[PDB]
């Protein structure tokens, strides 16, 4: 549906975030950071998805100020490491955030994994954070419709965002569908499945007929079922070609075979496993 990579989801307070971005999970601190960003930047990405627990906070934030384009164009994520929930702790957490970003506020923060008992302390510091005007957007990662429920109980703000792990061997069915009726935009981390599907079949035949790379094919499909994506890349022509998914469209028989691939099968933690 997005034309281009300026291409944007407008969230529920009205915030336009873009619906592609560059994930910088795995990417090491420094220069491969600085230098992911900055090409990515270059070659027309509006958004960059990093976290305190990355390490790379840092070589993100001298990309983007070394990438030449405007902050207010540029969309920032982080999040809130597992170690760091509670309420004076995330307050804590976010303003090192900022130190580290060399960022005056985020686009987007979100609590990084829901574990078990903390995350709606977690909440109200993010409330609070997004009142002060110092994020322009708050929500999750990693939660369960249980959790989201449990959370909107006493919530004053209902997450903006749900970023979760999002690929044809985890298609998030029940998950899609519950935060559509919430208003809560489904994004994917790691949406290429770290490479897992390179040379999946049933992918392989999608990418033949339409000249396109697999990679190319899942973020098309990403985009066709309405979830933001944010690929990892650390390479310029990888990273281009990612991006290069706005001249080609899948068919409905295509979608529907990339989402017969499902399995349930998780490359990163399952949420409801990953308690702390």
Known sequence: MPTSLKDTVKLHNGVEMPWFGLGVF??????????????????????????????????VGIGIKESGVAREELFITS?????????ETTLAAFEKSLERLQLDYLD????????????????????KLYKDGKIRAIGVSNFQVHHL?????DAEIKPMVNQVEFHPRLTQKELRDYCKGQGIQLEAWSPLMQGQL????????????????????????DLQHGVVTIPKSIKEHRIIEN??????????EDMDKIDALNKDERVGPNPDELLF
């Open 198 to 221: 390179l040379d999946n079949e049933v992918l392989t035949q999608i990418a033949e007929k339409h000249n396109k790379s697999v990679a190319q094919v899942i973020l098309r499909w």
């Open 149 to 153: 429920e449990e959370l909107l109980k």
């Open 79 to 87: 999040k809130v490491w597992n170690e760091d929930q509670g309420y």
């Open 26 to 59: 795995k990417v090491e601190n420094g220069n491969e950071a600085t230098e992911s960003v900055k090409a990515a930047i270059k070659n027309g990405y509006r958004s960059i998805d990093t976290a305190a627990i990355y390490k790379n906070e840092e070589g």
């Open 243 to 252: 991006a290069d998914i706005f001249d080609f469209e899948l068919s409905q």
């Open 108 to 127: 987007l923060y979100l609590i990084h994994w829901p574990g078990k008992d903390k995350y709606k302390d977690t909440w109200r510091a993010l409330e």
